[PDB]
Design a protein around this nucleic acid. Sequence first.
RNA 1: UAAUUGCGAUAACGAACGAGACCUUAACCUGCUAAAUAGCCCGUAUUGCUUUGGCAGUACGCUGGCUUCUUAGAGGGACUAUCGGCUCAAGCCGAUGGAAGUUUGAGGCAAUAACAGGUCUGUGAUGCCCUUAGAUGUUCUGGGCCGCACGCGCGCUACACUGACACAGCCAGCGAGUACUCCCUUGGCCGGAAGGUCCGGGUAAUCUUGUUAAACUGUGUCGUGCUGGGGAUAGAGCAUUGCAAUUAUUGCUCUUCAACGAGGAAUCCCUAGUAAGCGCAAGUCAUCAGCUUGCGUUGAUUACGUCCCUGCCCUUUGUACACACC
Lengths: 55, 202, 71, 143, 62, 50, 26, 99, 139, 141
Amino acid sequence: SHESVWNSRPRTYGKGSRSCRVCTHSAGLIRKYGLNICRQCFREKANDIGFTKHR
Amino acid sequence: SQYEVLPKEVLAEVGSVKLFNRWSYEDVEIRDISLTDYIQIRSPVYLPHSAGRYAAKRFRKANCPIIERLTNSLMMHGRNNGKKLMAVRIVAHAFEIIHLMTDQNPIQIAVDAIVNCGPREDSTRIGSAGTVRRQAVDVSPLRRVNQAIALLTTGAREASFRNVKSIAECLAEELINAAKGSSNSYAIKKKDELERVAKSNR
Amino acid sequence: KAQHAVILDKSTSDKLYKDVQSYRLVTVATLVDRLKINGSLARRCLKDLEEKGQIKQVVGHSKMKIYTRAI
Amino acid sequence: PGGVTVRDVEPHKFVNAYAAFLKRQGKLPVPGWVDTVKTGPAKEMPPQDIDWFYVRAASVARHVYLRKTVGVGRLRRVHGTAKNRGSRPSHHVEASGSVDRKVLQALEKIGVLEHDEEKGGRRITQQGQRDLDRIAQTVIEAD
Amino acid sequence: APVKLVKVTRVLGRTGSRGGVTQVRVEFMDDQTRSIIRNVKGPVREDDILVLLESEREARRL
Amino acid sequence: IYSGKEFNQVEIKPEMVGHYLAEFSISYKPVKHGRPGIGATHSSRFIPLK
Amino acid sequence: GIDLDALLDLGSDELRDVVHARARRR
Amino acid sequence: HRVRITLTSRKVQALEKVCSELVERAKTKDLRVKGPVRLPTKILKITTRKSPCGEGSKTWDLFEMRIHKRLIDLTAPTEIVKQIIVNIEAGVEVEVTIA
Amino acid sequence: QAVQVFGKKKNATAVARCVQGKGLIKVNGVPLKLYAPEILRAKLYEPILLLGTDKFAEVDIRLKVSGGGHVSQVYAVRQAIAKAIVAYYAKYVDEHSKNTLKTALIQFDRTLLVADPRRCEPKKFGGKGARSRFQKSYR
Amino acid sequence: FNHILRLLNTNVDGKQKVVYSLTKIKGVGRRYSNLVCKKADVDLSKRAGELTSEELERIVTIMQNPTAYKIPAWFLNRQRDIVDGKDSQILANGVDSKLRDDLERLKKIRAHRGLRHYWGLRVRGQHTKTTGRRGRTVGVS
RNA sequence: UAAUUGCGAUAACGAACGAGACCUUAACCUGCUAAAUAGCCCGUAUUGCUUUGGCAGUACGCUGGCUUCUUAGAGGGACUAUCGGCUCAAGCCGAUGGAAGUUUGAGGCAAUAACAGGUCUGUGAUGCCCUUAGAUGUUCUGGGCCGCACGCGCGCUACACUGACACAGCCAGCGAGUACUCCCUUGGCCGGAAGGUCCGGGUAAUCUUGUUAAACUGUGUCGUGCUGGGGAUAGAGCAUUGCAAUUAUUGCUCUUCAACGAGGAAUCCCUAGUAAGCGCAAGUCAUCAGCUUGCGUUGAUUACGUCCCUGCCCUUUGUACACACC
Ligand SMILES: [Mg+2]
Ligand SMILES: [Mg+2]
Ligand SMILES: [Mg+2]
Ligand SMILES: [Mg+2]
Ligand SMILES: [Mg+2]
Ligand SMILES: [Mg+2]
Ligand SMILES: [Mg+2]
Ligand SMILES: [Mg+2]
Ligand SMILES: [Mg+2]
Ligand SMILES: [Mg+2]
Ligand SMILES: [Mg+2]
Ligand SMILES: [Mg+2]
Ligand SMILES: [Mg+2]
Ligand SMILES: [Mg+2]
């Protein structure tokens, strides 16, 4: 709980800094255009965002 | 006519189309009448490099010039795949060397070599579940041209492998030996052994 | 392992200067077999004969060169 | 009658002709390490010539002549080659910016090229274009 | 025995287990009244010229 | 020096200058091979059925 | 390449120029 | 004054009509209009593995979003500009540059 | 008097202008005899060899070729030149001669005039190429 | 001429050119022998055999004295002697003799890199399951 | 017929899915629309040879016109069109024209029924069970996931002369890029290289960027030698990213120079811009791409057939099978 040791290690970069903005999942994250959404959750919300299959 | 865009070595042969600007096609005949319709020499070509669609679909490669076909066969193995200009360079150097060796028309030598390397009898493998039996069958004219081009090129290719004898002047003697009918040619030996096996399996 | 000489001694020099006239084609490979000579010296020999006017060139391509007798 | 420029001359013959002209003149300054470097990490062996720098200067000068402008970065990309990275696949790698930079500075000193403060890089000069045209003329005279 | 040449009249159809051999109707140029059937390996079409070695055997399905 | 689970006593020598302290405390120990198991080879993973 | 007596009393910057590149970066 | 109108959207039919409608009312009031300009389309591609667990045959998704950007050059004072683009439908964007 | 044509092969395209005047053909300023690699140059002179060498004596042709590979750009140049002379002898000359020149190109090589409609097949997943598939092992 | 030469402590072929004949001296590679020949004012076209004995002595001495002949300090295969602190280019018999010394120093301090060498394993962090493969089966029984 | 695709026969008639149809993309338009964030022509100024007309010539408010090339919208275009055959039909073959005549090429979508297929380690999606202050929650240091007798799978580099190396020539396309902090980076300067530094451009058809990619072509060196092929293992030094480089992150310089000379029994992929060779961008990302997803360059041999092997679809037939020939 003490601020010096609690979560002391910096998180400027790495997979610990970034997580899915809807399901806090680190692996398979999509951040090509600032989406910051894991691949599993993106497939559900792809049509809502404006992504569609054409080919 | 201020600027003459054509080179002097090109303007000298305006009259007729000559392969590599050196050799003509009129004095080239075929001893075997069967391969006349499947060897394209009625239409002269300057270079053995055309982006023709000769697989759309069937019997279109017959109309392909036989010099085109020879060049395609050099670019065979993986390191040589996709290298047509190098094959053209090798093929061009071969005919001129044949001309110096024989003092004949090199196209006449190449056509004679291709005619002499085509086996006229082969055997297909039949039987029942590994009981290997062979039945002697005839060979179509189109396959004979394909077989001759394949056999000629592989012998030149393997001979040049790990040998000081360079590929451009290697290919020359197999074309020369085959036209001469020499038994030292690799294609002649494989052609004869295929026909010998086929005769056994008649 | 055929040993190809890197120095043209008296025996090979005289053979080269007396037999190259009758050779229809004078290539780097042709000298190596008929003279047992290194390729680099074979190429220099081809240049030397050309300077003497004893054989004429057909191919000036860098990657492979053709020389033939002139009579 | 004409009347000819660098365009109507084979580049292989032009660079050799201009390399001899610079070497015969001897005015072109050369760095001391010309006999040491191998012109880039992508290369394996140093150049097989003592006169390679004069050829490089001639080749670069023609390049600047034919383009609007060029700097050290562009020429590194142009002169870069594929690197033999052992068992890993080859990749394109730039080539020894110091060699290119010194060539540009030397050509600037002898008046062939001049710097452009509005666009960056270096461009051909009136004397530079005049000098190359004379060399191209001699090539046809040699032909 | 001498070799002889023939002209392909009719492409009867494929044969063999794997369909790599074709049966063709065959006539002789020297004897226009003689017609036989032979098996051919390779792409064949009508009005082709074929070379037969010891043309005595009659073709059979493979 | 702490090596994973326990502290290893290392005395610094003048020849030890220029190296990390992790050099002198191994963390994995050498591998002394034993005997292959059932799934070590293709011809040994078959379990008999009686 | 420095004797042990002066090596232990050597200054930081002088220590820097001698040590390995990785040591220098640290 | 020269003002540049930038129209960025995703629906072609919506963009085509508003581009036509905006320029059509421009001639009616007799202004000098240069355009419209059809900039190259922008295709946003996202390739994703279909399976959420990595099991099965490898099948991949290709989600594509098309962005269409249009330019209109108008020669009119800013007072006119605020009265010429009053009715713009949803799904499209309008940008102005003063020159 | 001027006409504009273009030739295509893969991504390589070559835009050509035919201008009345002294007979000269230039590719990106460089003369045609010195543009292409020497082994490919026989292809470039082929349209002129097929036609009359004096039929290009009254035209000024300049090309600007880019977009593809070195081999493809050669095919773009040769096709554009053949179209340029045909266009000139159609607009400014009676098409009977144009018909005579067009056929001379046609019964030799159709590619001299009509562009080859072949492009790269798009890649599919599961393999390195359009048709090739990754190697698989059943055991 | 002069088919066989003797330089430093290695036999040298005379039929091969100067640079690649000198590469057989271990501790000298293709590039290092190239600079040495250029610094020694010796023609590169002629072979190593037909060199004059005065050329040989010029070539050898410049090898053990690279710094004295304006050779850049970054060709040297040791740029900092950890015991001496001086650049040095090491010839045939020295690298093998010196290689033990570096291994001896690493071993006597019980460092990880020296320990890996003594055990006989990869020392540059390589993976060692499917690619060591020294011996043989070792079957299941 | 690719097709339960149709012609037809007909105790069936009339329908619904799937196929097709449909959508995306590639190839055509010198027809329309209109472009200073794309070009061309014209003219102005200027450069070099010729000076006798020709050069990527060079120069955004240097510019009057146009849209062939480029961009992108509406449209047109192919429907087997015409011709010669077979046939009652469905259709099939060849030739001509045409950019295109395998459904024009390639994809997306894709039916009923089911698997005890995979995922509880994507989810604040969850039932039950377990644990819940010495935690199986959470956080911090270090280590490990890389550890090495051995077997297997996907790949990279190679065994060279159709080659290696050195110079010279020298052509793409798909895309990405800066806010609470630096993303793509130009040009100038220093250095052998990796790199360092300074002024700046770009929130993007504008700048990186024509990403001058590699393969490839030309002229030379080498030479049939496990050799200038091959770059495995290893030693030394120098920088970069990171708070941290040791079990070398990676990069560069020198040196060390292993097997390997085309590969057994077996086995994989593939029919035209295809296989194969070659590289580039994106994802991962502070750094690392021998991986994948796409893109382009060079560009073939051989069928265009069959049910012989391995499987699939329909009908007839046999069955002691139904957990269905494992
Ligand atoms: Mg280059
Ligand atoms: Mg491929
Ligand atoms: Mg389709
Ligand atoms: Mg789940
Ligand atoms: Mg936990
Ligand atoms: Mg931890
Ligand atoms: Mg796999
Ligand atoms: Mg491979
Ligand atoms: Mg090279
Ligand atoms: Mg481009
Ligand atoms: Mg990357
Ligand atoms: Mg991966
Ligand atoms: Mg029964
Ligand atoms: Mg039962």
